[PDB]
Tab-separated table of C-alpha atoms in Angstrom:
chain	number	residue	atom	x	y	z
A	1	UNK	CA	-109.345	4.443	72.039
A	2	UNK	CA	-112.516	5.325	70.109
A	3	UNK	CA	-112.501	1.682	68.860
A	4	UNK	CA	-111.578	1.873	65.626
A	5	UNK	CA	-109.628	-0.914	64.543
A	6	UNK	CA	-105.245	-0.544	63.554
A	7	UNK	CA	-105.659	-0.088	59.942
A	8	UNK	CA	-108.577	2.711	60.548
A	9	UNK	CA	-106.518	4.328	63.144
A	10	UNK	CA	-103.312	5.079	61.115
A	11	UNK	CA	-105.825	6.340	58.129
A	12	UNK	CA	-107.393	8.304	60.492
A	13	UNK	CA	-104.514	9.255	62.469
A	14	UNK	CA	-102.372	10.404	58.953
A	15	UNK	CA	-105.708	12.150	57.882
A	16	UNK	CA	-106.534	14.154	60.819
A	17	UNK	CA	-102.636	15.285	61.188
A	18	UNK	CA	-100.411	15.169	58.217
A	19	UNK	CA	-101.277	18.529	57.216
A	20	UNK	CA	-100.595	19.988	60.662
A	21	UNK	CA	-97.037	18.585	60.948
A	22	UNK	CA	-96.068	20.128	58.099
A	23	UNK	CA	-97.778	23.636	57.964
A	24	UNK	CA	-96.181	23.563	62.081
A	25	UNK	CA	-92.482	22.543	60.316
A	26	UNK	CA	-92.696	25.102	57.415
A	27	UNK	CA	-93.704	27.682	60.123
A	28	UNK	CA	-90.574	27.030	62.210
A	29	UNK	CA	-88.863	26.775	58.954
A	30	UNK	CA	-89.784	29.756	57.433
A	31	UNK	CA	-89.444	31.640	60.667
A	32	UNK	CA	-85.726	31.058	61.105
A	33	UNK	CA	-84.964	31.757	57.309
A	34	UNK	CA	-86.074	35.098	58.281
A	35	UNK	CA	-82.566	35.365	59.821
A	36	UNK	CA	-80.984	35.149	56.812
A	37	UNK	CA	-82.219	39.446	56.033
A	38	UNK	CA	-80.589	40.708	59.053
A	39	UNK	CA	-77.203	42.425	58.831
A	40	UNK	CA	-75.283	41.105	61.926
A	41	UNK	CA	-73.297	38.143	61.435
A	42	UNK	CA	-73.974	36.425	63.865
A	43	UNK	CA	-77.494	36.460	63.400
A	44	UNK	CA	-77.348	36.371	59.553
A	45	UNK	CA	-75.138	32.943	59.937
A	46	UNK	CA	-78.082	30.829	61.035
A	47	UNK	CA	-81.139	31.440	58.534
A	48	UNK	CA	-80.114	28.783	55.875
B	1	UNK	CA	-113.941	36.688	44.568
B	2	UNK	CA	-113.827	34.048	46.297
B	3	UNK	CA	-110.506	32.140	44.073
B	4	UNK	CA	-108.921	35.664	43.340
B	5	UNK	CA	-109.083	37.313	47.498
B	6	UNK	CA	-106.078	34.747	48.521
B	7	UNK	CA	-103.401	35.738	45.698
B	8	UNK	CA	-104.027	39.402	45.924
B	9	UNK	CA	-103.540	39.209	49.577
B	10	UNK	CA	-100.551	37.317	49.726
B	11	UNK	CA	-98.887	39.585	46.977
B	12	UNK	CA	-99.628	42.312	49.125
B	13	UNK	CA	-98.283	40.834	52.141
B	14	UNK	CA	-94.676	39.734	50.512
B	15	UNK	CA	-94.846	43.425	48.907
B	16	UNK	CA	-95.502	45.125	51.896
B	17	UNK	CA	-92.799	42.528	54.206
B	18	UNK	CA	-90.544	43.570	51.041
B	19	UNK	CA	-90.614	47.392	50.972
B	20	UNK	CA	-89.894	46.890	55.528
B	21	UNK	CA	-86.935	44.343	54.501
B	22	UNK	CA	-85.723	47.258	52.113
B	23	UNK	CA	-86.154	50.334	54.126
B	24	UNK	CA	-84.541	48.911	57.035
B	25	UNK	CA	-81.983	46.965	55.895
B	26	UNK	CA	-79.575	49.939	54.806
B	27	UNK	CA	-79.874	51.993	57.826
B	28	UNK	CA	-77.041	50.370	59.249
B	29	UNK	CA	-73.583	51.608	59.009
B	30	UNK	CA	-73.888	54.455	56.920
B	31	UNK	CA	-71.591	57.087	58.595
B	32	UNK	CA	-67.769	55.334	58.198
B	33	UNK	CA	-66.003	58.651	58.234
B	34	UNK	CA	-66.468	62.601	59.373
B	35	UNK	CA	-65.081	65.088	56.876
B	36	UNK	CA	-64.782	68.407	58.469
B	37	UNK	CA	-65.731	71.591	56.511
B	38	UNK	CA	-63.701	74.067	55.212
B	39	UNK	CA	-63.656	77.794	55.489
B	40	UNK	CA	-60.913	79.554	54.077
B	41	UNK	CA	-60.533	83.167	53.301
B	42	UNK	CA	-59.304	85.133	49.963
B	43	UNK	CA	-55.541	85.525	49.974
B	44	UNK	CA	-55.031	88.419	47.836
B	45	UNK	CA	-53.013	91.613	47.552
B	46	UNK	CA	-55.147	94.624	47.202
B	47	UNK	CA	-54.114	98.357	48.745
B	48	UNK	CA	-50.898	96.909	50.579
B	49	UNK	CA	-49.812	99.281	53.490
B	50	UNK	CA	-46.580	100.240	52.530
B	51	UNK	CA	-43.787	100.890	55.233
B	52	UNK	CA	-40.490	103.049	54.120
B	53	UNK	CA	-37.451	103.341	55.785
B	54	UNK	CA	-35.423	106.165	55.374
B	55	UNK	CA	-31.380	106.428	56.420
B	56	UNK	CA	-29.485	110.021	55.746
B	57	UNK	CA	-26.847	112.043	57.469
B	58	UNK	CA	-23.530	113.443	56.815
B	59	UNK	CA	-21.501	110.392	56.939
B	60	UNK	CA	-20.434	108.346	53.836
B	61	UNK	CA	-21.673	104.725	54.898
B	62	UNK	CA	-23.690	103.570	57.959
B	63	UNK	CA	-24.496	99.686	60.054
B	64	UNK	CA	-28.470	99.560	60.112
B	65	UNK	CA	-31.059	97.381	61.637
B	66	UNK	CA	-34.433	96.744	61.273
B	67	UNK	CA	-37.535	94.931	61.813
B	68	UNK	CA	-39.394	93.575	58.192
């Protein structure tokens, strides 16, 4: 929409956001391995 | 500092997330059983009473009861 052509766009695009998507997936994956310290079962069961 | 501040601080992070993980983590559980004390008392013989019975008359024998 800014007007750069297809080719800048997905430079731009993988550029400006490639970094987020993973620092946001290590955060929810890091989060959850959390679980795996806990001492209930239950909980324990779903870090890894 | 400036390439030495981020290390540090992460290694004291982990250290510090560490020592929680360890300090809570056994505070579970940790009472299975309850013994119950014990307080007995010396079972000796020292200055027994003593207790004597006496049986005499002018007959030869004699039936006799008693209490121990």
């Amino acid at each position: 929409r800014a007007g750069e052509d297809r080719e800048s766009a997905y430079y731009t695009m993988f550029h400006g956001t490639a970094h987020v998507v993973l620092a946001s997936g290590l955060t929810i994956a890091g989060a959850t391995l959390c679980l795996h310290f806990t001492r209930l079962p239950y909980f324990q069961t779903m870090g890894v | 500092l400036g390439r030495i501040w981020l290390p540090v601080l992460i290694v004291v992070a982990v250290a510090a997330g560490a020592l929680i993980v360890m300090n809570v983590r056994t505070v579970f559980g940790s009472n299975p059983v309850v013994v119950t004390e014990k307080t007995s008392d010396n079972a000796e013989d020292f200055n027994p009473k003593v207790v004597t019975y006496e049986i005499f008359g002018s007959g030869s024998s004699a039936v006799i009861n008693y209490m121990d």
